[PDB]
CSV table of C-alpha atoms in Angstrom, one decimal:
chain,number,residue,atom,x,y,z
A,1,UNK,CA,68.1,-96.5,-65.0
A,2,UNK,CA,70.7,-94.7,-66.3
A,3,UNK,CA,69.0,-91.5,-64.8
A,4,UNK,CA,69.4,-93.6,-61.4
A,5,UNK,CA,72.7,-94.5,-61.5
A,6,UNK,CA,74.0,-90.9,-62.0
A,7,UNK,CA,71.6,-89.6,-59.3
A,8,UNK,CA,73.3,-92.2,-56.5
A,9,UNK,CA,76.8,-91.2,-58.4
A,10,UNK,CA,75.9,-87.2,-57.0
A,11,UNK,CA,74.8,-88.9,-53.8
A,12,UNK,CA,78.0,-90.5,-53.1
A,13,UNK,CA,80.4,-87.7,-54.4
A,14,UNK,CA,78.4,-85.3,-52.4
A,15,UNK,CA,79.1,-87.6,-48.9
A,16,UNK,CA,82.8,-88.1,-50.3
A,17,UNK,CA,83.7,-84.3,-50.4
A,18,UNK,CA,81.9,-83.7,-47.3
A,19,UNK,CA,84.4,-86.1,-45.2
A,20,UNK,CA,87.2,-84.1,-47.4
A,21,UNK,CA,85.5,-80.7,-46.2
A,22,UNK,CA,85.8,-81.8,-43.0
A,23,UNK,CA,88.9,-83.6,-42.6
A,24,UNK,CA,90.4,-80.1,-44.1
A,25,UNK,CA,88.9,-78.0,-41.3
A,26,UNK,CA,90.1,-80.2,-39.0
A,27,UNK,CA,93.7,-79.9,-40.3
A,28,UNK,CA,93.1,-76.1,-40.2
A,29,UNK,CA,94.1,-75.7,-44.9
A,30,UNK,CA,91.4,-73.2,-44.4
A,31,UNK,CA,91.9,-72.7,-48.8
A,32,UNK,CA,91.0,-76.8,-49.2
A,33,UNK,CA,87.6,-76.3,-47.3
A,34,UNK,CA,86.6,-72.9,-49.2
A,35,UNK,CA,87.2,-74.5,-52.6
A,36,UNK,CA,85.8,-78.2,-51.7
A,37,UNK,CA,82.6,-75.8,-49.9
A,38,UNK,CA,81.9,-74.5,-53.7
A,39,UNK,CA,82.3,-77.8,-55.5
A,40,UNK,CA,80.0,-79.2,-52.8
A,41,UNK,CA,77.2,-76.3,-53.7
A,42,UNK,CA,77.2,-77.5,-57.4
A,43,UNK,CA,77.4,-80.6,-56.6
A,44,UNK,CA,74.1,-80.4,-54.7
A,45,UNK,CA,72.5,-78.1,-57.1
A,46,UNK,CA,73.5,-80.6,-59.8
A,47,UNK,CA,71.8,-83.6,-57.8
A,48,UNK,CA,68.2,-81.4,-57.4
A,49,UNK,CA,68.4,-80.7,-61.0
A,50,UNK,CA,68.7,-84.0,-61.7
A,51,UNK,CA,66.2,-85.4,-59.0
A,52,UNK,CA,63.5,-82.9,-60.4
A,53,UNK,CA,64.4,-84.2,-64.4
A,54,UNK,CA,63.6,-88.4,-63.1
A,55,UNK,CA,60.5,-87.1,-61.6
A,56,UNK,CA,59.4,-84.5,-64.4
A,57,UNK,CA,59.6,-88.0,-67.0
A,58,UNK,CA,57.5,-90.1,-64.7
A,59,UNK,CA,54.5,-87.4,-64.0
A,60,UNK,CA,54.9,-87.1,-67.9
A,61,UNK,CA,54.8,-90.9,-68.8
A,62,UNK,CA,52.0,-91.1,-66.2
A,63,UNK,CA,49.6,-87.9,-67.2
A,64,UNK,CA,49.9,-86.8,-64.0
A,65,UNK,CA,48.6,-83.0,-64.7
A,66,UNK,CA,48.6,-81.4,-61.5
A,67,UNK,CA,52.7,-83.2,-60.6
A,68,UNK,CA,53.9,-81.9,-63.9
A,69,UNK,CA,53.1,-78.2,-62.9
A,70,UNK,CA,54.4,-78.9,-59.2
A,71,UNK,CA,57.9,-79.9,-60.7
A,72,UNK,CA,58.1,-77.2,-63.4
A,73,UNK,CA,56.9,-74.5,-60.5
A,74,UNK,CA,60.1,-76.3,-58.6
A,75,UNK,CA,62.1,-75.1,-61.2
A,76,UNK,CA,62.2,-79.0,-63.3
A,77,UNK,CA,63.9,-78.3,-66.9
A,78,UNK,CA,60.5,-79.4,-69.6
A,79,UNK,CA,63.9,-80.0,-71.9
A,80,UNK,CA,65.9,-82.3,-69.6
A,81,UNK,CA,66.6,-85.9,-71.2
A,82,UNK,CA,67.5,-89.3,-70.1
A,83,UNK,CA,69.9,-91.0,-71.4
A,84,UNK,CA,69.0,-92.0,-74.8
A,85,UNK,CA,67.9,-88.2,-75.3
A,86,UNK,CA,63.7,-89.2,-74.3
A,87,UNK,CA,62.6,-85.8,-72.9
A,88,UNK,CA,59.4,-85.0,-71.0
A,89,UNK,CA,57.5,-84.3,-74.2
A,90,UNK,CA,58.4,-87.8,-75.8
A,91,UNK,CA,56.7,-89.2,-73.1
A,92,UNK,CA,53.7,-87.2,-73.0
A,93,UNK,CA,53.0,-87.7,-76.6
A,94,UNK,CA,53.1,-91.5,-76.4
A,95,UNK,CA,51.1,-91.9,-73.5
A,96,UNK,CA,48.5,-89.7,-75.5
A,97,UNK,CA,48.9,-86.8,-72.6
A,98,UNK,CA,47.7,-83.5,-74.3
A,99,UNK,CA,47.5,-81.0,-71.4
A,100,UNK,CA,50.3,-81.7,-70.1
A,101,UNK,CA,51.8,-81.6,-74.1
A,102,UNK,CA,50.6,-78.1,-74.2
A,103,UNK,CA,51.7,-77.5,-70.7
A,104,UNK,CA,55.4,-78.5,-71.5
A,105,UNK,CA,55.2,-76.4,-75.0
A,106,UNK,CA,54.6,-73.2,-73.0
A,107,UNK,CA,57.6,-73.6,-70.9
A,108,UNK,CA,59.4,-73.7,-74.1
A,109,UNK,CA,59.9,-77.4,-74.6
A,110,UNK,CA,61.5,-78.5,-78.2
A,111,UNK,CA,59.0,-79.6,-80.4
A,112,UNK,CA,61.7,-81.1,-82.5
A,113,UNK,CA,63.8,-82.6,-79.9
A,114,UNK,CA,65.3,-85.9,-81.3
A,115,UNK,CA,66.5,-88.8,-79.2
A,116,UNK,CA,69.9,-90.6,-79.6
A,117,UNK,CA,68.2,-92.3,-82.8
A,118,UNK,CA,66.3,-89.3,-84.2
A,119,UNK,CA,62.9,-90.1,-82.5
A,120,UNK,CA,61.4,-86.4,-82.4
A,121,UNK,CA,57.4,-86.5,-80.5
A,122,UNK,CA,55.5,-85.7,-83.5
A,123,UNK,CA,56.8,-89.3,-84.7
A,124,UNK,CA,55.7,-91.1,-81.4
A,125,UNK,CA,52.5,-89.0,-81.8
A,126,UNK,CA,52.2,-90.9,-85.0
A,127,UNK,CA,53.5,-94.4,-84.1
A,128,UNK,CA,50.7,-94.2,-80.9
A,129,UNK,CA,48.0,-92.7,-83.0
A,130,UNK,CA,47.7,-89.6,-80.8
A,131,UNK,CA,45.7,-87.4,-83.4
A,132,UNK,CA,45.1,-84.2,-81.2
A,133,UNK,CA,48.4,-84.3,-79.9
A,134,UNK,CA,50.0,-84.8,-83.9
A,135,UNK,CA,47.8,-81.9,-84.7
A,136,UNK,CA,49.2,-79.7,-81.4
A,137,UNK,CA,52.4,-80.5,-82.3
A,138,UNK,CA,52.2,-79.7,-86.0
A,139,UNK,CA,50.6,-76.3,-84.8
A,140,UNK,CA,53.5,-75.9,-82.5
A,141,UNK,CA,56.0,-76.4,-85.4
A,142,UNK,CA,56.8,-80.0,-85.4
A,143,UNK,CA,58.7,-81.1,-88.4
A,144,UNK,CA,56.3,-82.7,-90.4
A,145,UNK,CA,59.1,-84.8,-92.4
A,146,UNK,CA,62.0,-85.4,-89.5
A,147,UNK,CA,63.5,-88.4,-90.1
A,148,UNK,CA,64.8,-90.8,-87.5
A,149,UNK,CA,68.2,-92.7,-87.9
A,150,UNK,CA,66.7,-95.6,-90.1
A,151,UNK,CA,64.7,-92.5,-92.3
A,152,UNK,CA,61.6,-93.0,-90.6
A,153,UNK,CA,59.2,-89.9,-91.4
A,154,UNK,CA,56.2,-89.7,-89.0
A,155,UNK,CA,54.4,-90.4,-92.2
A,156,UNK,CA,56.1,-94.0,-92.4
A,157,UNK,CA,55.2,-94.8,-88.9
A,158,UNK,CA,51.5,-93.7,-89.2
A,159,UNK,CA,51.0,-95.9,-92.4
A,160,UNK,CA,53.1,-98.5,-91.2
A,161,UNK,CA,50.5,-98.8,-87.7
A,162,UNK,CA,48.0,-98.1,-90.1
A,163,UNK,CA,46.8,-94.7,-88.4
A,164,UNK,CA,44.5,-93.2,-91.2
A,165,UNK,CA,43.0,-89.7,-89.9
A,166,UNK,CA,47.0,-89.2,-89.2
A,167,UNK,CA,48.4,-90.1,-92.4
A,168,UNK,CA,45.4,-87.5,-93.7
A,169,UNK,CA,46.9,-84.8,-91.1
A,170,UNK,CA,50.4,-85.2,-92.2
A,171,UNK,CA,49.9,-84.5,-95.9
A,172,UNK,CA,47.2,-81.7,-95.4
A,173,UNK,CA,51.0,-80.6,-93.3
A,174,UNK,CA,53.0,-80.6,-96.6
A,175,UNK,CA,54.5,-84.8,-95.6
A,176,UNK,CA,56.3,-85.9,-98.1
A,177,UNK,CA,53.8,-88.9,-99.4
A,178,UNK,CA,57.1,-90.4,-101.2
A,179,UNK,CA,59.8,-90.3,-98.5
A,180,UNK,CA,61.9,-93.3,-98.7
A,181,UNK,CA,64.2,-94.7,-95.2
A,182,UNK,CA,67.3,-97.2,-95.5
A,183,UNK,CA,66.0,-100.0,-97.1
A,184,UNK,CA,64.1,-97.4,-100.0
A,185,UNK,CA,60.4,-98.3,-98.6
A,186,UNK,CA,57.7,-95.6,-98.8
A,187,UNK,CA,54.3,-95.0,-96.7
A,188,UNK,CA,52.7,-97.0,-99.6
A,189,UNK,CA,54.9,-99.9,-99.4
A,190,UNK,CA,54.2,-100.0,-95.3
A,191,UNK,CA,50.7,-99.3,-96.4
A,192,UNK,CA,50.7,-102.0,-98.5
A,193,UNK,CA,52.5,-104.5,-96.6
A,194,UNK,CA,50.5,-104.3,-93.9
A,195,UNK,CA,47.2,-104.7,-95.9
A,196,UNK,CA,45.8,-100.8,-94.6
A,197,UNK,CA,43.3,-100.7,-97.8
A,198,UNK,CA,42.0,-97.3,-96.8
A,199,UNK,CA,45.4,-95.7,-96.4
A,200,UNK,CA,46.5,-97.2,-99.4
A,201,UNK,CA,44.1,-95.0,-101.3
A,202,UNK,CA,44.7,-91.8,-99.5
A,203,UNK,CA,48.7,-92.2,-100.4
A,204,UNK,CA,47.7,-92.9,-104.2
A,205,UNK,CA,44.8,-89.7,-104.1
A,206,UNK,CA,47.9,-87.3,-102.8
A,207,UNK,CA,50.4,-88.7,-105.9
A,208,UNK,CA,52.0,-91.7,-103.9
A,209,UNK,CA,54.6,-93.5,-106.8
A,210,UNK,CA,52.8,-96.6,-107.1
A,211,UNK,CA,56.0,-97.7,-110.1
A,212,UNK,CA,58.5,-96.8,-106.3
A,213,UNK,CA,61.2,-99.5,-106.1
A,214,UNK,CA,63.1,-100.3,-102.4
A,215,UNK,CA,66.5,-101.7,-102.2
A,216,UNK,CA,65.3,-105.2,-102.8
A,217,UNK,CA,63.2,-104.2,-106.2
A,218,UNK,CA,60.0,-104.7,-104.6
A,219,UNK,CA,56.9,-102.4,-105.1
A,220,UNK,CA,54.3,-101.5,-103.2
A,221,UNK,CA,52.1,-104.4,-105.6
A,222,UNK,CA,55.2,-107.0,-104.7
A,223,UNK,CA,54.6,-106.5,-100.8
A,224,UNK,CA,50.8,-106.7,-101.4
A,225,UNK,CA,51.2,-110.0,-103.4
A,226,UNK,CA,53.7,-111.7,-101.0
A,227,UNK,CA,51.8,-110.6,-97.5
A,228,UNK,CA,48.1,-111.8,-99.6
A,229,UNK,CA,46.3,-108.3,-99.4
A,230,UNK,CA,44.6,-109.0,-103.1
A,231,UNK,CA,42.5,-106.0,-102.8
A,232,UNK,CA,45.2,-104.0,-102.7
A,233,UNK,CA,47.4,-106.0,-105.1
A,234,UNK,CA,43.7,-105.1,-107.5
A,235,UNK,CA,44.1,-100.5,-106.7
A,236,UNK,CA,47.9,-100.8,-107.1
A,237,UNK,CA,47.4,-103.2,-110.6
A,238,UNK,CA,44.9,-100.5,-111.8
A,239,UNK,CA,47.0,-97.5,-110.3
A,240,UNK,CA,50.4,-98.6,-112.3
Protein backbone atom coordinates (compact mmCIF):
# COMPACT_ATOMS: atom_id res chain seq x y z
CA UNK A 1 0.00 0.00 0.00
CA UNK A 2 2.14 2.32 1.37
CA UNK A 3 5.01 -0.42 1.11
CA UNK A 4 3.93 -0.38 -2.69
CA UNK A 5 4.02 2.99 -3.43
CA UNK A 6 7.62 3.48 -2.15
CA UNK A 7 8.77 0.32 -3.95
CA UNK A 8 7.48 1.86 -7.62
CA UNK A 9 8.98 5.41 -6.10
CA UNK A 10 12.75 3.25 -6.16
CA UNK A 11 11.63 1.85 -9.41
CA UNK A 12 11.26 5.07 -11.08
CA UNK A 13 14.17 7.01 -9.43
CA UNK A 14 16.39 4.09 -10.31
CA UNK A 15 15.28 4.46 -14.40
CA UNK A 16 15.52 8.37 -13.77
CA UNK A 17 19.24 8.33 -12.77
CA UNK A 18 20.05 5.77 -15.23
CA UNK A 19 19.02 8.26 -18.34
CA UNK A 20 21.14 10.87 -16.13
CA UNK A 21 24.15 8.26 -16.03
CA UNK A 22 23.93 8.04 -19.44
CA UNK A 23 23.25 11.29 -20.84
CA UNK A 24 26.59 12.26 -18.58
CA UNK A 25 28.76 9.67 -20.38
CA UNK A 26 27.58 10.77 -23.40
CA UNK A 27 28.61 14.41 -22.65
CA UNK A 28 31.97 12.91 -21.63
CA UNK A 29 31.56 14.91 -17.14
CA UNK A 30 33.23 11.67 -16.47
CA UNK A 31 32.81 12.99 -12.28
CA UNK A 32 28.60 13.28 -12.95
CA UNK A 33 28.57 9.48 -14.05
CA UNK A 34 31.02 8.16 -11.06
CA UNK A 35 28.90 9.92 -8.48
CA UNK A 36 25.22 9.21 -10.14
CA UNK A 37 26.93 5.21 -10.65
CA UNK A 38 27.10 5.20 -6.54
CA UNK A 39 23.69 6.77 -5.90
CA UNK A 40 22.32 4.23 -8.47
CA UNK A 41 24.01 1.12 -6.29
CA UNK A 42 22.09 2.34 -3.12
CA UNK A 43 19.39 2.99 -4.84
CA UNK A 44 19.14 -0.54 -5.97
CA UNK A 45 20.22 -2.01 -2.80
CA UNK A 46 17.60 0.15 -1.12
CA UNK A 47 14.78 -1.25 -3.67
CA UNK A 48 15.91 -5.25 -2.82
CA UNK A 49 15.73 -4.35 0.77
CA UNK A 50 12.58 -3.14 0.48
CA UNK A 51 11.20 -5.81 -2.13
CA UNK A 52 12.36 -8.67 0.44
CA UNK A 53 10.52 -6.51 3.62
CA UNK A 54 6.68 -6.57 1.34
CA UNK A 55 7.38 -10.25 0.77
CA UNK A 56 8.76 -11.23 4.33
CA UNK A 57 5.00 -9.58 5.79
CA UNK A 58 2.94 -11.54 3.36
CA UNK A 59 4.79 -15.21 4.00
CA UNK A 60 4.23 -13.96 7.67
CA UNK A 61 0.46 -12.99 7.44
CA UNK A 62 0.11 -16.24 5.36
CA UNK A 63 2.13 -19.01 7.66
CA UNK A 64 3.98 -19.71 4.90
CA UNK A 65 6.99 -21.60 6.91
CA UNK A 66 9.16 -22.80 4.32
CA UNK A 67 8.95 -18.66 2.28
CA UNK A 68 9.72 -17.06 5.58
CA UNK A 69 13.18 -18.99 5.84
CA UNK A 70 13.79 -18.41 1.93
CA UNK A 71 13.50 -14.60 2.48
CA UNK A 72 15.43 -14.39 5.74
CA UNK A 73 18.25 -16.83 4.03
CA UNK A 74 17.98 -13.81 1.19
CA UNK A 75 19.05 -11.59 3.66
CA UNK A 76 14.99 -10.08 4.50
CA UNK A 77 15.21 -7.79 7.77
CA UNK A 78 12.66 -10.13 10.55
CA UNK A 79 12.54 -6.21 12.03
CA UNK A 80 11.44 -4.33 8.81
CA UNK A 81 7.95 -2.41 9.12
CA UNK A 82 5.30 -1.03 7.04
CA UNK A 83 4.16 1.85 7.38
CA UNK A 84 2.13 2.06 10.41
CA UNK A 85 5.21 0.32 12.20
CA UNK A 86 3.38 -3.65 11.64
CA UNK A 87 6.49 -5.85 11.47
CA UNK A 88 6.72 -9.45 10.48
CA UNK A 89 6.12 -10.75 13.96
CA UNK A 90 2.73 -8.62 14.29
CA UNK A 91 1.58 -10.58 11.61
CA UNK A 92 2.56 -13.89 12.65
CA UNK A 93 1.14 -13.57 16.03
CA UNK A 94 -2.38 -12.62 14.72
CA UNK A 95 -2.65 -15.15 12.20
CA UNK A 96 -1.80 -17.66 15.12
CA UNK A 97 1.68 -18.59 13.21
CA UNK A 98 4.04 -20.14 15.95
CA UNK A 99 6.93 -21.59 13.91
CA UNK A 100 7.44 -19.13 12.05
CA UNK A 101 7.05 -16.70 15.58
CA UNK A 102 9.83 -18.63 16.92
CA UNK A 103 11.58 -18.56 13.66
CA UNK A 104 11.53 -14.70 13.50
CA UNK A 105 12.63 -14.49 17.38
CA UNK A 106 15.86 -16.27 16.58
CA UNK A 107 16.83 -13.89 13.92
CA UNK A 108 16.50 -11.36 16.62
CA UNK A 109 13.09 -9.96 15.95
CA UNK A 110 11.69 -7.33 18.77
CA UNK A 111 9.47 -8.89 20.91
CA UNK A 112 8.37 -5.49 22.02
CA UNK A 113 8.22 -3.80 18.82
CA UNK A 114 5.19 -1.26 18.94
CA UNK A 115 3.34 0.05 15.91
CA UNK A 116 2.62 3.72 15.19
CA UNK A 117 -0.22 3.27 18.05
CA UNK A 118 1.63 1.11 20.52
CA UNK A 119 0.39 -2.25 19.24
CA UNK A 120 3.31 -4.59 20.50
CA UNK A 121 2.59 -8.76 19.26
CA UNK A 122 2.06 -10.05 22.68
CA UNK A 123 -1.15 -7.74 22.55
CA UNK A 124 -2.37 -9.14 19.09
CA UNK A 125 -1.50 -12.55 20.62
CA UNK A 126 -4.05 -11.61 23.17
CA UNK A 127 -6.77 -9.75 20.99
CA UNK A 128 -6.60 -13.23 18.55
CA UNK A 129 -6.47 -15.61 21.45
CA UNK A 130 -3.14 -17.13 20.25
CA UNK A 131 -2.34 -18.92 23.67
CA UNK A 132 0.99 -20.76 22.69
CA UNK A 133 2.11 -17.91 20.85
CA UNK A 134 1.24 -15.38 24.21
CA UNK A 135 3.09 -17.93 26.20
CA UNK A 136 6.29 -17.87 23.50
CA UNK A 137 6.28 -14.48 23.54
CA UNK A 138 6.05 -13.94 27.31
CA UNK A 139 9.02 -16.60 27.42
CA UNK A 140 10.82 -14.46 24.87
CA UNK A 141 10.36 -11.34 27.07
CA UNK A 142 7.26 -9.72 25.88
CA UNK A 143 6.11 -6.91 28.08
CA UNK A 144 3.42 -8.41 29.89
CA UNK A 145 1.87 -4.79 30.71
CA UNK A 146 2.84 -2.62 27.32
CA UNK A 147 0.30 -0.28 26.77
CA UNK A 148 -0.92 0.89 23.41
CA UNK A 149 -1.82 4.62 22.74
CA UNK A 150 -5.44 4.37 24.17
CA UNK A 151 -3.62 2.33 27.48
CA UNK A 152 -4.62 -0.94 26.22
CA UNK A 153 -2.62 -3.66 28.34
CA UNK A 154 -2.69 -7.13 26.54
CA UNK A 155 -4.68 -7.93 29.70
CA UNK A 156 -7.59 -5.46 28.54
CA UNK A 157 -7.78 -6.98 25.14
CA UNK A 158 -7.90 -10.60 26.37
CA UNK A 159 -10.84 -9.84 28.87
CA UNK A 160 -12.31 -7.49 26.60
CA UNK A 161 -12.51 -10.72 23.70
CA UNK A 162 -13.16 -12.65 26.50
CA UNK A 163 -9.98 -15.02 26.08
CA UNK A 164 -9.93 -16.89 29.53
CA UNK A 165 -6.74 -19.36 29.57
CA UNK A 166 -5.00 -15.93 28.46
CA UNK A 167 -6.14 -13.68 30.97
CA UNK A 168 -4.92 -16.72 33.47
CA UNK A 169 -1.41 -16.56 31.47
CA UNK A 170 -0.99 -12.97 31.92
CA UNK A 171 -1.35 -12.70 35.61
CA UNK A 172 0.55 -16.01 36.41
CA UNK A 173 3.20 -13.17 34.10
CA UNK A 174 2.97 -10.53 36.91
CA UNK A 175 -0.28 -8.38 34.46
CA UNK A 176 -1.31 -5.85 36.22
CA UNK A 177 -5.19 -7.08 37.04
CA UNK A 178 -5.98 -3.27 37.73
CA UNK A 179 -4.53 -1.34 34.75
CA UNK A 180 -6.67 1.38 33.73
CA UNK A 181 -6.51 3.05 29.65
CA UNK A 182 -8.00 6.63 28.75
CA UNK A 183 -11.41 6.40 29.62
CA UNK A 184 -10.21 4.67 33.46
CA UNK A 185 -11.80 1.07 32.42
CA UNK A 186 -10.08 -2.02 33.89
CA UNK A 187 -10.04 -5.91 32.62
CA UNK A 188 -12.97 -6.27 35.02
CA UNK A 189 -15.04 -3.56 33.67
CA UNK A 190 -14.32 -5.12 29.91
CA UNK A 191 -15.01 -8.32 31.63
CA UNK A 192 -18.01 -7.25 32.94
CA UNK A 193 -19.31 -5.36 30.06
CA UNK A 194 -19.09 -7.98 27.89
CA UNK A 195 -20.92 -10.54 30.20
CA UNK A 196 -17.41 -13.07 30.34
CA UNK A 197 -18.77 -14.64 33.76
CA UNK A 198 -15.72 -16.97 34.12
CA UNK A 199 -13.17 -14.18 33.62
CA UNK A 200 -14.94 -12.06 35.85
CA UNK A 201 -14.01 -14.42 38.67
CA UNK A 202 -10.47 -15.07 37.78
CA UNK A 203 -9.93 -10.91 37.81
CA UNK A 204 -11.73 -10.85 41.37
CA UNK A 205 -9.55 -14.33 42.74
CA UNK A 206 -6.13 -12.30 41.67
CA UNK A 207 -7.41 -8.82 43.80
CA UNK A 208 -9.31 -7.11 40.70
CA UNK A 209 -10.89 -3.55 42.54
CA UNK A 210 -14.42 -4.44 42.23
CA UNK A 211 -15.15 -0.45 44.20
CA UNK A 212 -12.74 0.79 40.46
CA UNK A 213 -14.44 3.92 39.01
CA UNK A 214 -13.71 5.02 34.98
CA UNK A 215 -14.07 8.50 33.89
CA UNK A 216 -17.72 8.26 33.59
CA UNK A 217 -18.22 6.93 37.45
CA UNK A 218 -19.26 3.58 36.32
CA UNK A 219 -18.08 0.26 38.03
CA UNK A 220 -17.57 -2.88 36.86
CA UNK A 221 -21.46 -3.65 38.65
CA UNK A 222 -22.78 -0.30 36.56
CA UNK A 223 -21.56 -1.90 33.13
CA UNK A 224 -22.98 -5.38 34.29
CA UNK A 225 -26.41 -3.74 35.10
CA UNK A 226 -26.74 -1.55 31.91
CA UNK A 227 -25.37 -4.38 29.24
CA UNK A 228 -28.07 -7.11 31.51
CA UNK A 229 -25.30 -9.68 32.59
CA UNK A 230 -27.31 -10.30 36.23
CA UNK A 231 -25.06 -13.05 37.18
CA UNK A 232 -22.41 -10.98 37.22
CA UNK A 233 -24.21 -7.82 38.48
CA UNK A 234 -25.03 -10.94 41.63
CA UNK A 235 -20.43 -11.83 42.12
CA UNK A 236 -19.73 -8.11 41.81
CA UNK A 237 -22.84 -7.15 44.50
CA UNK A 238 -21.40 -9.85 46.84
CA UNK A 239 -17.65 -8.97 45.93
CA UNK A 240 -18.14 -5.08 46.94
Amino acid sequence: SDLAAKLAALKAAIEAIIKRIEEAEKNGDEDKVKELREKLDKLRKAYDRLELIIRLLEAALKGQIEEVRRLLEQGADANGADGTGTTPLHLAATSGQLTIVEILLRQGADVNAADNTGTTPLHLAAYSGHLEIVEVLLKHGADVDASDVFGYTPLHLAAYWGHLEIVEVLLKNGADVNAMDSDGMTPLHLAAKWGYLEIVEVLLKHGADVNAQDKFGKTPFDLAIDNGNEDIAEVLQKAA
